[PDB]
């Protein structure tokens, strides 16, 4: 009775009402899948362009290849537009500075064309070399530009007055609510001058990221004061601050309370201290006290994401964490640095951070009295812990990590164990056995014991892996340490620290061990960061040899080592050759420069597509 059906002339997804085809394509967030979906038929192409929520412009909007495109190239519902990665990288886009009137009308035409394809931009990211970039761009989106992210890894123009970098946004974009200056270098005097002399646009800001490309020593109390007082509507603030009490203008107890009083509706606060290895401020005390933190935590009842990553220490912080649980019941994401006495766990109960039951993410840097008894009590009170991490804690053992992994089996999914003293790689991987089948992300520093490796289960849900090494150390003993079978591992991030002219040059014909990752089946994306790893070709061969053995290497971000006396991070000739042999690459991003032509990578790699020399360090070479 039930016959099998044959060839059918109807397509169900095309017989759907077109609003429903738009709804389907709106969940497809993979860009390459969106591009392929627009090639299936003309109806899905209309669906892809009409529902694409974001886009990062690839190529040069100045070239005729963009200005003379059809109007079927039109994204009506596009919200976020990223004009940061426009080619050439780092060049001023739509600038008004000559390298007379012909450039004034060319900028208007390129802006009018960009307004055509994206006529509803509410979030804009752009490489802002000088403020005329914002002046020539905002006219078309000034009425709906809610969030703006500026990117400048270049030198600040020396003639610009204070605050000139942000004036075009504060004068024109009346819809501005979120300003992201995390990767936009400028003087701390710039942010203070502009945000305190524009009380009309500033009074509406709710998100502020003042990272300034990690090129400032932190905002002073005389600077964070007026900024907080001018933005009484901030809900999220991210900024480095000067916490060193050696300076009279540091951020202490009084600066914190004045920040919480001027911004009571804060829900996300991330203050950090710029690290500088020369000072070596390991145990030096900070101008912040536990008695002041309690009064500071009492003024932020809406606080949910707190991060105070310090280098100067804060002592007897156990009562402050208990006050954070009482005065801030919605706390969930806590990252603390150099906080001492975070959990005594002496009279049992749950003192310190264990009182904060609602914690979903906990991260602790440089806690010298965080012991196994603390991690035991932390696992009793923080039953909702989904992300856990300890950094620079020298009293935690594998028994504390293993107990926490067992008592937090249902919820713990991501673990960070960096530079802990009593925790080596092979011993720490064994401690995470209770969640070996559940952990999804892992970040560990690699320390080898020269007895049990070459010289077990399967991580069934581990998808992301982050590794920290030292100059001259090997990755090969990682397989012999416990990570011998990770089936669903798709991305890996590698970072190398330490000086180069002090580690003995490893015996030639040895390699770091990139080829030993071939046993990982679905390892696609890799982040190899060797920037802080210092003949230089000998050191790139050491770290890049064998990367061609990774058969499924899809996307690669490479950071070449810095130079002792040069501002360029050039790829040596053997470094280019070992990357050119990665035939499976789709995206290739070198965080530096190379003397080889950018097309040689496209000829050596058949399916290569996205390639760019993104020089995203603070002293950009300024190539023209």
């Amino acid at each position: 009775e039930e016959v099998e059906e044959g060839r059918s002339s109807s397509s169900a997804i095309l017989d759907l009402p077109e609003p429903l085809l738009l709804h389907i394509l709106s969940f497809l967030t993979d860009v390459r899948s969106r591009h392929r979906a627009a090639l299936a038929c003309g109806r899905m192409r209309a669906a892809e362009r009409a529902t694409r929520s974001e886009l990062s412009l690839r190529g040069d909007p100045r070239s005729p290849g963009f200005l003379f495109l059809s109007h079927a190239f039109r994204f009506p519902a596009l919200e976020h537009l990223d004009l940061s990665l426009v080619s050439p990288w780092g060049h001023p886009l739509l600038s008004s500075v000559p390298p007379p009137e012909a450039i004034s009308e060319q900028n208007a035409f390129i802006a009018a064309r960009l307004a055509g394809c994206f006529p509803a931009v509410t979030s804009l990211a752009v490489y802002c070399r000088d403020p005329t970039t914002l002046a020539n761009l905002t006219p078309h989106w000034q009425a709906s530009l809610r969030r703006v992210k500026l990117v400048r890894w270049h030198q600040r123009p020396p003639t610009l007055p204070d605050g000139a970098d942000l004036e075009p946004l504060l004068e024109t974009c009346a819809a501005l609510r979120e300003l992201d200056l995390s990767e936009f270098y400028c003087w701390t005097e710039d942010v203070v001058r502009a945000l305190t002399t524009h009380p009309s646009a500033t009074a509406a800001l709710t998100h502020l990221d003042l990272g300034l490309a990690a090129a400032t020593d932190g905002f002073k109390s005389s600077e964070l004061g007026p900024i907080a007082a001018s933005c009484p509507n901030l809900r999220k603030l991210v900024a480095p601050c000067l916490f060193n009490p050696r300076f009279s203008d540091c951020v202490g107890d009084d600066a914190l309370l004045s920040l919480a009083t001027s911004c009571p509706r804060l829900t996300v606060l991330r203050l950090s201290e710029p690290f500088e290895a020369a000072a070596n401020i390991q145990r030096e005390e900070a101008a912040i006290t536990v008695a002041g933190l309690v009064a500071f935590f009492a003024a932020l009842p809406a606080l949910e994401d707190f991060t105070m990553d310090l280098q100067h220490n804060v002592l007897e912080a156990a009562p402050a964490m208990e006050a954070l649980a009482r005065r801030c019941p919605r706390i969930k994401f806590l990252t603390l640095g150099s906080f001492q006495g975070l959990c005594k766990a002496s009279w049992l109960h749950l003192d310190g951070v264990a009182v904060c039951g609602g914690l979903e993410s906990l991260y602790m840097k440089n806690c010298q009295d965080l012991t196994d008894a603390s991690l035991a009590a932390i696992g009793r009170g923080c039953r909702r812990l989904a992300k856990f991490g300890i950094h620079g804690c020298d009293l935690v053992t594998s028994a504390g990590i293993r107990r926490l992994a067992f008592t937090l089996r249902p919820t713990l999914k991501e673990v960070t164990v960096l530079h802990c003293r009593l925790l080596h790689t092979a011993e720490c991987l064994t401690a995470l056995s209770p969640i070996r089948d559940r952990i999804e992300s892992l970040e560990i520093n690699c320390v080898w014991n020269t007895t049990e490796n070459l010289y077990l289960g399967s991580w069934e849900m581990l998808r992301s892996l982050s590794l920290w090494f030292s100059a001259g150390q090997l990755l090969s003993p990682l397989i012999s340490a416990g990570l011998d079978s990770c089936p669903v591992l798709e991305e890996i991030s590698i970072k190398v620290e330490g000086d180069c002219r002090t580690c003995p040059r490893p015996a030639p014909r040895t390699i770091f061990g990139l080829s030993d990752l071939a046993g990982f089946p679905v390892l696609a994306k890799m982040k190899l960061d060797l920037s802080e790893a210092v003949d230089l070709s000998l050191w790139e061969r050491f770290y890049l040899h064998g990367i061609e053995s990774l058969q499924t290497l899809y996307e690669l971000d490479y950071w070449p080592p810095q130079d002792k006396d040069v501002h360029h991070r050039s790829l040596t000739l053997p470094a280019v050759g070992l990357i050119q042999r990665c035939v499976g690459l789709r995206k290739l991003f070198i965080h530096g420069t190379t003397h080889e032509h950018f097309m040689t990578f496209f000829l050596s790699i058949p399916n290569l597509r996205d390639m760019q020399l993104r020089e995203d360090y603070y002293p950009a070479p300024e190539n023209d």
Binding site: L14, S26, V31, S33, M44
Partner: protein, 122 residues
């Protein structure tokens, strides 16, 4: 709650807020099974959605049209995400094969779509 189908908790559908002449008796059996399982006050709750979505493509597209006439936002999004992940990672021809799509692009209209795609990073 005495839900009369067309062949022969009932509140998740904001069109209910009875005769249902647009949904069959097989698709309404899956619609009711979806809302019964979700009226609960994690992983298990989300793991059942994938098991409930292990249906044939003919049944899936009837579920999409049902969760659109009926106003079940949580069901219309769950079934639409399934079709979106099907399109994910497939070549244009593979997308045509799964959904029986006919290539209606002229050799130049397809070349324009390709040329347009070269302006967005992946």
């Amino acid at each position: 709650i005495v839900l009369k189908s067309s062949d022969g908790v009932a509140l998740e559908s904001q069109t209910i807020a009875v005769p249902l002449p647009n949904v069959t008796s097989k698709i309404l059996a899956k619609v009711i099974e979806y809302c019964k399982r979700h009226v609960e006050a994690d992983d298990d709750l989300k793991a059942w959605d994938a098991d409930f979505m292990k249906i044939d493509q003919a049944t899936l597209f009837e579920l999409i049209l049902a969760a659109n006439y009926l106003n079940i936002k949580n069901l219309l999004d769950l079934t639409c995400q399934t079709v979106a992940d099907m399109i994910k990672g497939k070549t244009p021809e593979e997308i045509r094969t799964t959904f029986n799509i006919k290539n209606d692009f002229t050799p130049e209209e397809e070349e324009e779509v390709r040329r347009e795609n070269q302006w967005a990073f992946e």
